[PDB]
Amino acid sequence: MQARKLAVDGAIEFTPRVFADDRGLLILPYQEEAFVEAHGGPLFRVAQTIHSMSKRGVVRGIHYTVTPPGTAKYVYCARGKAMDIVIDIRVGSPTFGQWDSVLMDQQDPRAVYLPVGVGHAFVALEDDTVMSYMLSRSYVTQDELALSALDPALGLPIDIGVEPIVSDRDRVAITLAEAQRQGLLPDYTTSQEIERRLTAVP
Amino acid sequence: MQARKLAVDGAIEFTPRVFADDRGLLILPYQEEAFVEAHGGPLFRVAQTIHSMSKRGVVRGIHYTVTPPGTAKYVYCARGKAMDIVIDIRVGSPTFGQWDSVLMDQQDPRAVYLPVGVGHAFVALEDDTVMSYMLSRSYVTQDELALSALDPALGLPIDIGVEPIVSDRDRVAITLAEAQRQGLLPDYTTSQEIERRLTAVP
Ligand SMILES: Cc1cn([C@H]2C[C@H](O)[C@@H](COP(=O)(O)O)O2)c(=O)[nH]c1=O
Ligand SMILES: Cc1cn([C@H]2C[C@H](O)[C@@H](COP(=O)(O)O)O2)c(=O)[nH]c1=O
């Protein structure tokens, strides 16, 4: 497993080796040693998992959790192909307002660790694209907020030549700048404090 | 999410609801609240995950970890279709020697919790079948043992109309009864002690 720090502070791309034999293939998308090496502590305790399947051209996001309590996440693409996007919405972060992207496919699988307090989006590049997540806390509707992924300010890589397929909640989402003004974005210091508790060495 | 106790003591089948919209489908394969209700405590700390893809007719198993240290697992089928099999190989268990099976498909997805000490096997019923696991301990080759899945004493449902595709290590595995005589099986009491430590609420 190789680890590469993303441009959004604390976000990490992991590239597992793919093992093949006559029966099929194997990857180990999360591995404690590689994770600790890159992050400095183990994964959060897992509260919930997600299996999301999307049609080509679906854009989901930008999703974040009200912080506190916040949510950290670990995601990979288990089928199909996605452009995964991390957006740093943590006020005070050295990388506030920046994003980075990871192409997730089946030939060269990559997983991403999303710190507490960041935003997540993706676009499905193929039908039957599965995004598989581990979360640090169960999804609670009242704590789950959204920002506009289509915000021309951000210029996210979410246009693939079809009209995007977007939910109501994502379509009407306010922009990053509007959320900031309203006091709705996570604070970087607070986010890192929570994150260090979640990923503390037992 | 609904939970159902399997015939192997402590093994549990979870049935998440399938949510659908214009974008696709969503299931939540692992959910802490349902898990805690059924098991009595939260999932183990996740040491490692697995993404395994198999051709139709592959049979993997029966696999178990030397106990101690042992491994508990949580598994679901993220693509394709599998017959998932849990085998109680824990000497002293009230359900020793029994197995149970769960059909894992895309239409009515099911996840299974495998206690410490039990054996696991599955048969892939479609090409490109993906089994997705969370593990309590990282895989260590020297601790990963096998038992014969073809054992006539068990009658596992593993031939589906094509010549089974089996690894050499699985093909030459000894039977459950032989492994018991050789002293190679997990002990139930020990397994339960490990399990209680892993899944403690504190
Ligand atoms: C991702 C997720 C969504 N949901 C629900 C909330 C919404 O009613 C619906 C779609 O959510 P979404 O707008 O975040 O895609 O599914 C959960 O209950 N738990 C989850 O983990
Ligand atoms: C399942 C698994 C297998 N392996 C290795 C051991 C073997 O050399 C090969 C196949 O293992 P298997 O016979 O248990 O399927 O993959 C790992 O290193 N980590 C894992 O988690």
Side-chain angles (χ1 to χ4, degrees):
Chain A
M1 176 159 276
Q2 298 183 358
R4 186 180 69 88
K5 297 174 312 291
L6 299 177
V8 169
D9 184 64
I12 309 161
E13 177 200 81
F14 294 96
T15 302
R17 293 189 289 146
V18 186
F19 305 98
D21 74 359
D22 80 337
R23 297 172 297 168
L25 59 75
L26 167 74
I27 60 172
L28 304 175
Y30 170 74
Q31 295 171 40
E32 59 186 342
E33 291 213 346
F35 189 84
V36 173
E37 290 175 351
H39 177 67
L43 195 69
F44 48 81
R45 294 299 293 272
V46 177
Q48 194 195 297
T49 61
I50 295 167
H51 171 112
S52 170
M53 187 184 260
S54 300
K55 294 173 190 188
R56 185 174 192 260
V58 165
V59 181
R60 304 186 187 248
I62 299 167
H63 297 154
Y64 70 105
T65 305
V66 174
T67 302
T71 306
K73 310 174 184 167
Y74 193 87
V75 61
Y76 85 106
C77 176
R79 185 183 179 179
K81 191 185 280 189
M83 186 66 73
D84 198 55
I85 309 158
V86 54
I87 309 88
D88 199 342
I89 64 171
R90 299 169 296 186
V91 175
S93 173
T95 53
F96 181 73
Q98 296 183 217
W99 59 265
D100 204 351
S101 64
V102 173
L103 178 65
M104 293 185 172
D105 69 29
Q106 298 316 300
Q107 176 66 207
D108 299 280
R110 296 169 242 153
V112 172
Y113 172 71
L114 303 165
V116 177
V118 304
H120 185 234
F122 72 93
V123 56
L125 303 177
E126 297 185 353
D127 284 338
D128 306 318
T129 290
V130 175
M131 294 294 271
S132 176
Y133 303 69
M134 297 182 284
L135 306 185
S136 67
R137 91 179 276 105
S138 295
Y139 181 117
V140 172
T141 293
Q142 289 67 338
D143 298 338
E144 288 296 316
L145 303 181
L147 307 168
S148 178
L150 303 190
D151 184 358
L154 284 174
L156 297 188
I158 56 57
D159 189 349
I160 69 173
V162 303
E163 198 62 32
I165 300 166
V166 178
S167 67
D168 291 333
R169 166 165 108 89
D170 289 358
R171 185 185 65 259
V172 307
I174 65 180
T175 64
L176 187 163
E178 178 60 9
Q180 186 173 10
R181 189 192 71 79
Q182 288 188 36
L184 298 173
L185 294 184
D187 174 75
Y188 178 71
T189 296
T190 301
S191 293
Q192 284 206 318
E193 291 162 356
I194 292 166
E195 188 178 16
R196 277 196 291 266
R197 290 195 288 273
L198 289 173
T199 63
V201 174
Chain B
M1 180 165 268
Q2 301 185 330
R4 186 175 71 88
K5 295 187 285 229
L6 295 179
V8 170
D9 183 75
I12 307 159
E13 178 197 79
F14 296 94
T15 300
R17 185 153 312 268
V18 181
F19 293 93
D21 72 1
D22 284 332
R23 297 174 298 167
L25 301 165
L26 173 68
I27 62 174
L28 312 179
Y30 173 75
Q31 297 172 41
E32 181 173 274
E33 186 172 2
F35 188 87
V36 170
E37 176 172 7
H39 176 73
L43 196 70
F44 49 80
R45 177 174 294 272
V46 179
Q48 187 173 70
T49 61
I50 294 176
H51 174 109
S52 160
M53 191 183 249
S54 302
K55 296 174 193 183
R56 182 166 166 282
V58 164
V59 186
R60 301 190 188 249
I62 293 164
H63 293 154
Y64 68 106
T65 306
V66 177
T67 305
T71 307
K73 309 173 189 164
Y74 193 95
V75 62
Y76 86 105
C77 175
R79 183 184 180 175
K81 188 183 176 179
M83 190 61 65
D84 196 61
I85 308 166
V86 58
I87 309 84
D88 201 342
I89 65 171
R90 298 168 298 186
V91 174
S93 171
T95 57
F96 183 79
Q98 289 181 239
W99 58 268
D100 208 349
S101 65
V102 174
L103 176 71
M104 293 184 168
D105 69 23
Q106 301 313 304
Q107 184 61 101
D108 294 284
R110 293 186 216 277
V112 174
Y113 176 71
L114 303 167
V116 177
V118 302
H120 183 228
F122 71 95
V123 54
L125 300 180
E126 292 182 3
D127 292 304
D128 300 324
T129 288
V130 173
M131 293 294 271
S132 179
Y133 306 70
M134 297 181 283
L135 304 185
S136 68
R137 175 173 187 87
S138 294
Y139 186 109
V140 173
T141 296
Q142 320 85 262
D143 296 336
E144 290 291 326
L145 305 185
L147 301 170
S148 181
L150 258 178
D151 183 356
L154 304 180
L156 303 186
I158 58 172
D159 194 297
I160 64 166
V162 65
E163 189 60 40
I165 302 170
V166 182
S167 66
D168 290 339
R169 89 168 182 109
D170 291 359
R171 284 193 192 269
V172 299
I174 64 175
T175 64
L176 182 175
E178 180 176 348
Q180 190 178 7
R181 288 188 288 267
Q182 293 187 23
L184 290 175
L185 295 183
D187 178 79
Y188 182 71
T189 295
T190 300
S191 293
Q192 296 284 87
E193 296 164 341
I194 296 161
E195 185 144 325
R196 273 198 301 276
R197 286 207 278 281
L198 289 175
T199 56
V201 177

